[PDB]
Each structure stands twice: as C-alpha cells, then as structure tokens.
Amino acid sequence: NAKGVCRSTAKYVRNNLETTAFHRDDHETDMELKPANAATRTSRGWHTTDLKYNPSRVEAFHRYGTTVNCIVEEVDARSVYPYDEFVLATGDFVYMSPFYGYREGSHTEHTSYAADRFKQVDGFYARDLTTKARATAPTTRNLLTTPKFTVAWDWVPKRPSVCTMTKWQEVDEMLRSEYGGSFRFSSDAICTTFTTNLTEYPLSRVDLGDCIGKDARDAMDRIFARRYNATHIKVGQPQYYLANGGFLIAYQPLLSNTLAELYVREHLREQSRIEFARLQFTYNHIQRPVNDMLGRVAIAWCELCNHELTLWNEARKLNPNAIASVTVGRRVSARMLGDVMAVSTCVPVAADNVIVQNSMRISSRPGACYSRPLVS
Amino acid sequence: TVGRRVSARMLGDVMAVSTCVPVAADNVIVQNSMRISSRPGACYSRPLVSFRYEDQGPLVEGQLGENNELRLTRDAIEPCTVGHRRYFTFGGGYVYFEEYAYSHQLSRADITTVSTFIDLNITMLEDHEFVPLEVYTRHEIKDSGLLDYT
C-alpha cells in the first residue's frame, strides 16, 4: 500500500521447520509490482515476475536455487444471509462475517478465526497499483490471514433489513387438487408440483409490514384484469400455503362464468325447496365432471414437462454454455461439477479489438495443426 | 417412456430393456475416498459405494452412477487431477467430494434451483481460477469438470 513493492524474500516451512527464501538467492530487495497481461477489465492482478507464462519454465526454475513471486489479485466476493461467511471468486470460503470489526456494532458478528489473524486498519488510504496515486477519502480496511493467502476488503456498516421473501413467479394458471390429506399445485408455466398441508398459513401475524401481502394482492389483480375479467369470477380472498421445499404460495381460486351458472341454478333449486365460497365443493354432480376434466389437463401438463425436461437435461450435458446462456438471458460460462452446474459471467470484447492469425499450421511439429484458428 | 425405472441398451438399431431393482437409501454407504492405492496416477471418476439389497443381507461393493443408479463394476477411472470438486446425486440430495475425498452430504433444498426454462435475478461472479502451484512445477493436470461434447 505504501509504495507498490514486495521484499523478494519469504518464510516457508519444509521438514517441519521454518526457512527463508530469496529471489534468485540475492539480498532483500523491494521488487516492483507490474500488471499481469491476462488481467481482465475487472478482475485485475499484479506480479513481481512473469516466469510462469513463458516457455522453458522448468529450466527457468532450475536456473536459480530459489525463486519468489509476489502476487496481488482483485476478486469478487459474495455473502448471503445471515452473513456469517463469504465466498471468493476463487471458490474458497472465508468463515468470517464480512461486517466483522472492532467497531461497537460489529464485534458481535460471527468469526471462526483468532484475533491474531485479523487486523482492522482505520484511516486507510488506498494506492492503485496501475496509477500510483493515493485515494481521496479514507476507509476502514479489514485484513485477514488464511494459511494460504492474506485477504482484504473495505469494511462498511451492516445494511438495513429487507423483506423475508421475494416474488419468484407470477402464474396465470395453477390447478389445486386435494389428495392423500395434502394439497397439490401444478401448472404448465412451472414444471415443479408443490405439496402442502390442508391448513392455511397465518401470514398476517408475521408479515407485520404487509410486504408480501401487498405484492400478492397487486399481482393477482393485474393478472385477473388482464386475462380473466370477462371469463371468470374470483371465489374469495387470497389464501397462503407453505409448500414443501421452502416456498410460500399465495393462491386465488377462480370459477369460469359457464361453471358459475351451475352453482347459481342449483342454489335456486335449493331455495325453491350468493357466496360461491360456501358452495364450491358441496355439489357432487357438478364436481365429478370437473375433477375428470381438470385431472386430464394436469396429467397433460405433466407429460409435456417430463418430455421437455428430458431433452433439455440431455442437451446441457453436451453444451452447458448454450443452455445456460438462453436460460439466464445473457452469455455465461458454465461447467458440470458432476450432477450440478457451476456458472460465471463472461466478459465482452469489441470486434475491432480482435485480430486473426494467417495460419493454423504448427512449425514446431510438422504432423500437427490447430483445429480452430488462432487470435490476438 | 415406460413411466418406471428401466435399464436400456442399444443393440444396433433397436433397444433391449429390463427392469431395474430398487434399493432403500439407508442400506447404502459411501466410501471416504476416490483414490486408488495400487496405482498412484489414477483415481475413480465417480464415488465408490457399499450396500445391501435387504437390511440383514450380505454386503455388496459397487460404484455410484447417474440418477441414483448403482453399478457393480468399480471401473470408471480417470488420471488424477488437481483442484477437483464434484457433487454427485445421492438419494434426494448430493454428496460433495473435494480433492478425491468425501466431505459432506447436502439436502436437495440447499442449492438454488434454476427456474423451469427462463430465469432472472440470479447472482453471479467473475470467477477467477487461482490455479494450484503444482500445475506449473510438476505440470499436473487441472480439473475441468465433466466433458462437454466439444
């Protein structure tokens, strides 16, 4: 931070004993950090030397007794609620809260490491390694030593809380059916079937801010006005169900105008001897045809989902980059880590910044040739 | 197509089929490592298992497969790599292996399921490899996940 250099010497352990190495076996010297050529626009990096990328690397290592290369690298990091840990872009976890610190509101945060391995620097002024200039404003910098590398990040106070749940999907058509003492919800828009107990969840006593309630009522009215205003009737107030797998389903039961008439005329015959919510399942002769009609619709959607999911799941094993890109709606790198997929954002490059080499031949070995063209 | 698990094999231009036999999840045990002691350059590609058809029956050695299948061979082998990480499906969840060693078992609800065919609001990072040092010195091969068609 003070100058942009490293000591050209390092402590290492071999034979269960500490020993000090020296770059090219010389004396302690402040070596200059220079940018890496492969450094991306965002994930920047710096080194004291480049010996790894050049050919004859083995001979370069054997040309000296000891070699030491100081690395500095800027990476993305993510932490999710409760924020007890964070993960680096390298795939490595750090078992400390990114909000941890000696400040009054932070020493209560989670940490797995001893105080010896953590230091918080106040009044810290950054120095960009590409443009040797101090930052205009001070910050508090957290510093942590893992057994592999040291890691640093700017400390910030914990953000204010947000609503416990987010709207995942709006669904125009969702069939609910009672079976085996549980509800089962299904749709053509989502291939999963949600299972739930018959009891409605008492959301009103937990969503004290009406954050989920407001979003549900508004979305249902938007959809109803758009697609059902002239074809169906809403039976009653929205109902909330906690589905297996950890989802909250807000549901609004509907009746088609043509079906509502059967309840109306049946009610008139009963009165001669309106609240649809009281009548919905009381007339077996009206419901029996409906269970068979809608049951066939639900089964048809299941068959389509199994057919489509099978093709889609096989395609991603052949080319995950293409399948992930169309699923996410932007170019992403993807890789199958066994039976799950890892993903990352690809970085764009303007077409005029790319140059193509005139030949795919290899001079070093006459029998081989590149199978895809070289570029710069 | 049949609506039940079946084994199938292409005998040229027609398909031979047979019924797979089910095994309860508690009768299956996963081994702690994928290393092969007999030959240091190789490692199993899919984890080893040991199980029983019936709770009181004799124990049977095998190897895991795709979608909860159990193979009786122990023959899927790779040259051993560095930086290896894998999640294998294991009875309504996953087993996580790191550097050819068993680590822990996740519930299927622990991973974010991508929406059916189109999804948004997904968070991601500009993944930076941080390759192990041995890839330069000993020139050992870096793990690259399962093979794409390309």
């Epitope: 993960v87 797995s112 893992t146 057994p147 | 068993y102 680590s103 822990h104 622990d110």
Partner: nanobody
Framework: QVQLVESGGGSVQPGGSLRLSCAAS??????????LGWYRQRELVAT???????NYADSVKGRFTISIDDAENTMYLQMNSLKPEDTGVYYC?????????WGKGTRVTV
C-alpha cells in the same frame, strides 16, 4: 441432515481438567470441515479453521487443546487447569462450505 452428539460436560473443582467431545453422523465428515470448534456464551473458545490449522482465545492459550479423530468422526477439546472464569455454556459447531450445524449447548461448572 447432519447431527452432532455432544458429550463430556459436567462439574469440577478449580485446577481440574475435562474432555468435551462432539461425534457427527456420517452425513458430515468433520476432518473435511472448513471450520469446527466450541463457542462460549456467542464468543469463540477453540477452533480448527482449516484441515490443518488451529485457533484459540487469548485466555485459553496453553490451557486447552483441540483435536480430531477421522475414524470415529468426532472432535475433542481437552481442557486443563480450569478456573471459575471458564464456567458457562459451551456450544460445539461445525460447517462445510456454507452448510452450518450447531450442537445443543452443554454447561461447565467450577
């Protein structure tokens, strides 16, 4: 789901010693955990923050020693020369790459 079977808690006299332990179900291998350890009431007491790296609170250095057995899939916290200030509830915890688990806390008296 992983489950921790905590044991060894109790009561002693000043200058005494104890041995706490937490055995884990086969669904979580302790020797592969990112972090493991005990927390007083929360505040850290002793942990293993990497498969071969150990940590302790300043008042605990030299008194307690944490260890692990991969065969029995259990960790131990040997604690010696105990003082009245060491009394309280101790909670064992283990975590694997985002998955986290807490044991039911056990009391220790002096």
């Amino acid at each position: 789901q992983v489950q921790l079977v905590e044991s060894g808690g109790g009561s002693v006299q000043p200058g005494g010693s104890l041995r706490l332990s937490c055995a884990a179900s086969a669904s979580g291998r302790l020797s592969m955990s990112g972090a493991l350890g005990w927390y007083r009431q929360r505040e850290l007491v002793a942990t293993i923050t990497d498969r071969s790296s150990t940590n302790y609170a300043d008042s605990v250095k030299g008194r307690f020693t944490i260890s692990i057995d991969d065969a029995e899939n259990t960790m131990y916290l040997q604690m010696n020369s105990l003082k009245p200030e060491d009394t309280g509830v101790y909670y064992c915890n283990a975590r694997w790459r985002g998955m986290n688990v807490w044991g039911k806390g056990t009391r220790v008296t002096v």
